[PDB]
Every structure is written in C-alpha cells, then in structure tokens.
C-alpha cells in the first residue's frame, strides 16, 4: 500500500559501529530512503535473471550478478550452504541479534569425506501427448492382533484365492470350508471379502468377483463357524454381485450371467441358513430385488439379477411376485423381435431375462394349470412361455416314468 | 410388574479359566492345522507314507541360499 | 397414575461396541416364563388365567415373535 | 484404518494417508408356500434367547449398495474395524 523503508532506528545502530555519537533523526531519514531505495533496484534486477535464467527461486547468484551489473562490489562468501540463523542477547537494557559463528579445525576440512562426482548434461526424449491424452509412462504424472500362525494362515489363503493358480485355489477353499478353528479370522475374511467386492467399482474384474463368491460359498459350508454375527457384511456383497450393472470389464463377451445365479443361488442359501423372524433377512431381501424389478429404468442386467435371485427363493416367491408382471414380457419383446438399433447389447440381455424367465415359470405354470395345456401359450405373452410351458409338463412326466 | 417395571438383562458372560485355556487353545490349534494344510497343499509336498497328501501332508524342505538369516535372526521383536 | 407414571391397566386407554441389552425386560422376560410355563397346562386354572392374560395384555405387543417362535417350533418337535 | 484389515486392498488402491408396493404384499405369510411345513405323517435375570445383530435388524445396509459404479465418481480410502464383542466365539 505505502512505500516501505528500513527503520530509522537501524541507521543509529550503524552509525554507532562507525563512531558517530549523536545523530539527528532528520539525517537518518536521508540514508534510510536511500538504502531502501537502492535495496529495490537489486531486488528487481536479481529477479531479471530469475526469470530470463529460468529458475523461479532467486538463488544467490541473481544478487550476485546483479550488483555486478551495478559496478558495485560483490558480497564474498554467500555460495555456500547456509541459512537463516539469528541469536538472541537480552542484556541489562541492549537488545539485540547477531550470529555466533563458530569454529572448526583445519585437519577436518582436508580429512571431510568429499561428495560425489556430478553428471554431464545430457538429452531425453519422450512422448507427452499422443494425439490425445497423455501416455502412462512414468516420465509423466501419475493421472485382538492375530498371531504369527494364523497371520501366516491370513496370508496364504488370501493370497491362493487372488488367481495364479488353480489348483492352490482348490486346496485353499477345501481348506476354508473343512478346518475347525478359524473363528478369530472371521472377521478378517469378512473384511477382506466385502472391500474385494467394493473394488470391483474401480476395476470391472469378473474373475475375482467369481473367486470372492467361492469364498462367501466356502465360509458358508464351514461346519464349526457361526456367520451369525457377520451375515450383515456378506449379505450386501453377495447383493452386489447379483444387482449391479456392470459386471465385466468387455460387456458383450464376458458371462456376468454366471456370477449372476451362482450369487442368486449364495443369497437363497444365506437367507435359507440364517433368516429368522428377528433378523428378516428373507424380507428384506425380497423387497430389494421387487422395488428393483417393478421399477423401470433398470438395465436388463439389475433386472436378471432381480429375477434370478427371486427365482431361487422358492415357488410361492415366483407365484406372488413374477407371475404378475408376466406382462413386462410383451415389453421386453418390444425390443427383441423388433428393436431399432439391432447392434446393440439391449438384445442379448433382454433374450437372456426372457430364457431366464420362462425357465423358471415353466414349473409355475405347471404347478397351476390343466394338464391339457391346448393354447396356454397364446393365452400366455407372446405364446413362447406357453411352449416352455408345455416342454415343462413333458420333463415332469419324464421324471414321473424315470421315478 | 408388567404394567410399569423395566430391568435392562445382559448375556450370560463365561468369565471361566479353564473353559477360557480351552478355547483359546483349541482356536490355536485348529487355525495353524488350517494353515499348515493349505500350506501344503497349495506347494510342494512330502509323506511319511507312500502317497499321503490327504493325511499327513508336510510341507517340502526348501534350501536356503544363505541359511543362517532365517535360522539365528528373531521374527518377532 | 402411579407417582406420574399411567399403568397399563385396562382401565386405561392404550474399540469394542458396547454390550448390547435385550429388549425385553426382566419382569417382562419373568412374565414369559411364567406365562409359557402355565401354558404347558400343568394345572388347569394357571392354563385359564394364563390364556386369558394372553387374551388381554394390552403390552404384550414387542413380545410376540418369542411366543410365535414358541408356538412354531414347538408344534414342530411335538408332533 | 489403512494398516487394518483389508491393508492389501489398500495397497492395491494405493491410498497412503496415515399398491403392489403395498407393505402386506412383502409379508411372508403372502409370499411364501407355508403349506409345504405343515408336517404330513412325519417319519430370566440374563436374557433367556439369544440377542440379534442391531446394525442389520435396525441399520440401513441398504445405503451400503450401490446404485451406479464403475462408470460413476466416487472415492474410497482406509477404513477402520471395530470388534462387536456381543457376539461369542471371540476370545477378546
């Protein structure tokens, strides 16, 4: 805001180490304008080789050649590594600063072990952009304790089920699902098991999401250990893998429809084991896939999940819950059999939810029919639930003739 | 009572010794004969008897290249 | 009012995680005892007051799914 | 906790610091084949039962799932563990 100025109390302090004794305050206003004037044509100039000498620190050498551009005499002895180092000295009324320098012997200045030898100038070249963004080179930015046993124990089997092979894998879930101690490593797996799943959200893994269901369908065949307590952890994982979106990584190629019923046929078994009047777990479930299969705007993906997990619940769940929106079938075949865009993935998912469907209301519409069956399937949505229907009725009869 | 009488109640609590040894060293045993059996299983294996992976599995004997680090030095310090 | 509390009378009209309480009190953990117990029908006129203690118990409500699940589970290993 | 359980998870992140809606239709006795139970010719100062996990028969795990992921932007980092000691079988 205001021109700022050394103090005119710093200039009596001066004149005493000359031997001025008294010094009045009008003369000491004209040297303190002068110096701080002078201070600031060095401060501008020292920055005139920070900034043509491109360096942005303002290294003493920019003073240096600045007072060599203003014939004055260089300041000796500033190129060495120093700081900023004050001493305080109270005193019976004096109060003041100075440096304390000290002091070493000449021997330790021949005998200092000496620094290493520097390196030429040389070149490098690399990519920065390639017609795009950048490359991920690395010339570049980057965008209540377990025992040493069972830590041991924690290690190996965590890293078996992460996939270099197949056979420790094996070995490793036989060993989850038939050893009788592995209670205080519970928790641990549970950990581990639901933040696997959580990054699957970073990197659309389906394989390690197919090793992390082995898991949860492991620990659950353990006879010794009660997942009573961490059900609440493994629930919401295993809904993951049935109700998200994205499975794959390339969704046109990759069967996210396994891990989709191997997941359904997990939960039917976790709310078959574990649902209780107290917990109402089977409830809960259930309402989760109906608000997320009635709703629309779901993606054929979430919706076989839905229907795959509410299908593996029993029969009376698909007779009071898919057998009324039996009719979403004709709205599904609204984009089968015609659909605009043929090149698509809204078909494969949709044919998919449609053999998925009349798959699992084949037995349903066996259970609560006529035996004839004539036009079940015109009465039935798009007379193909129908054929299902009656291609059921002549397995039933081939297993009735097997029994 | 019911009309107006509330006490809060708590889970039984096993403050036992002997039952509380029991199960700590039964949860010792039972996760390092876990350990030691997907240990071996998932590597090379040996057997006292002729072909005997599912009982009695022992891990393989692995050489060092230097010996004495994993023999003299303490793991837990 | 018994000193300020209304008794439910049918007179009247209506790191470690800490160690959790049932929700259940003792006196109403004591009354199902006791009602489970004269139920099982070991002298016939604990049974009638026992049945009709069912029939009335305005806050036996936040007790039903014990005696639901004692219902249930018991017709199932008694037949 | 980013030492904690799941550290490897961690790790592998890298992250350093540190009317049919109707509530009857979903009641179990609508939606479930009972009759199939119905057995046909087969052949109390400390809590008497057993208390139930408070976080899933209160908690809303359902805020735990997600609605959209991997084409979606939000973060995740280091998170800690706590050790319910209601339940048995825990040494500590």
């Not at chain 1, 260089?74 to 590594?81: I, M, S």
């Not at chain 1, 000295?89 to 290493?116: C, H, M, Q």
């Not at chain 4, 890298?14 to 979903?26: H, K, Q, R, S």
């Amino acid at each position: 805001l205001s021109n700022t100025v050394l103090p005119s109390e710093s200039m009596k302090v001066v004149a005493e180490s000359m031997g001025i004794a008294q010094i009045q305050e009008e003369t000491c206003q004209l040297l303190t304008d002068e110096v701080s004037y002078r201070i600031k044509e060095i401060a501008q100039d020292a920055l005139k080789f920070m900034h043509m000498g491109k360096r942005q620190k303002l290294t003493t050498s920019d003073i240096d050649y600045a007072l060599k551009l203003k014939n004055v005499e260089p300041l000796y002895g500033f190129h060495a590594q120093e700081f900023i180092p004050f001493r305080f000295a109270s005193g019976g009324g004096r109060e003041l600063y100075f440096y304390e320098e000290k002091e070493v012997d000449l021997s330790d200045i021949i005998n200092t072990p000496l620094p290493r030898v520097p390196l030429d100038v040389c070149l490098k070249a690399h990519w920065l952009s390639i017609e795009g963004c950048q490359p991920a080179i690395p010339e570049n930015p980057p965008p209540h304790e377990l025992s040493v046993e069972q830590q041991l124990y924690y290690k190996e089997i965590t890293e078996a089920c992460v996939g270099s092979c197949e056979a420790k894998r094996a070995e490793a879930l036989q060993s989850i699902a038939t050893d009788p101690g592995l209670y205080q490593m519970l928790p641990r797996f549970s950990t581990f098991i639901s933040e696997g799943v959580r990054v699957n959200v970073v990197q659309n893994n389906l394989a390690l999401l197919i090793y992390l269901m082995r898991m949860v369908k492991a620990l659950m065949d353990n006879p010794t250990l009660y997942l009573e307590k961490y059900v609440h952890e493994l629930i919401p994982a295993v809904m993951t893998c049935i109700v998200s979106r994205q499975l794959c990584l390339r969704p046109d190629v990759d069967n996210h429809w396994a891990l989709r019923d191997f997941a359904a046929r997990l939960v039917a078994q976790i709310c078959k084991h574990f649902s209780t009047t107290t917990n109402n777990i089977q409830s809960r479930i259930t309402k989760t896939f109906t608000k997320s299969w009635v709703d629309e705007k779901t993606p054929w993906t979430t919706r076989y999940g839905s229907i795959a997990g509410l299908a593996e619940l029993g029969h009376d769940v698909i007779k009071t819950l898919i057998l009324p929106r039996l009719q979403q079938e004709g709205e599904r075949i609204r984009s089968v059999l015609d659909g605009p865009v043929l090149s698509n993935i809204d078909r494969i998912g949709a044919d998919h939810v449609q053999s998925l469907l009349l798959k699992h209301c084949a037995p349903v519409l066996a259970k609560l029919r006529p035996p004839p069956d004539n036009q079940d399937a015109y009465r039935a949505e798009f007379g193909s639930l129908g054929p299902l229907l009656c291609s059921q009725v002549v397995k039933a009869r081939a297993q009735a003739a097997l029994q | 009572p019911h009309t107006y009488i509330k006490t809060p109640t708590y889970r039984e609590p096993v403050s036992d010794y002997q039952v509380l040894r029991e199960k700590a060293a039964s949860q010792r045993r039972d996760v390092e004969r876990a350990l030691t059996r997907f240990m071996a299983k998932t590597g090379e294996t040996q057997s006292l008897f002729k072909d005997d992976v599912s009982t009695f599995p022992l891990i393989a004997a692995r050489p060092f290249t230097i010996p004495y680090l994993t023999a003299l030095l303490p793991s837990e310090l | 009012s018994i000193e300020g509390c209304q008794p439910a009378i049918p007179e009247n009209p209506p790191r470690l995680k800490p160690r959790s309480i049932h929700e259940l009190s003792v006196e109403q953990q004591l009354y199902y005892k006791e009602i489970t117990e004269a139920c099982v029908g070991s002298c016939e006129a604990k049974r009638a007051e026992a049945l009709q203690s069912i029939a009335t118990d305005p806050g036996l409500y936040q007790m039903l799914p014990r005696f639901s699940t004692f219902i249930s589970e018991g017709v199932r290993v008694n037949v | 906790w980013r030492y904690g359980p799941a550290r490897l998870w961690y790790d592998m992140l890298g992250v350093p610091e540190d009317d049919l809606l109707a509530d009857e239709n979903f009641l179990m006795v609508t939606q479930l084949h009972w009759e199939d139970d119905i057995i046909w010719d087969g052949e109390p100062w400390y809590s008497i039962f057993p208390i139930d996990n408070e976080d899933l028969v209160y908690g809303r795990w359902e805020d735990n799932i997600i609605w959209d992921a991997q084409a979606m932007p939000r973060l995740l980092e280091p998170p800690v563990l706590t050790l319910d000691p209601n339940d048995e079988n825990l040494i500590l």
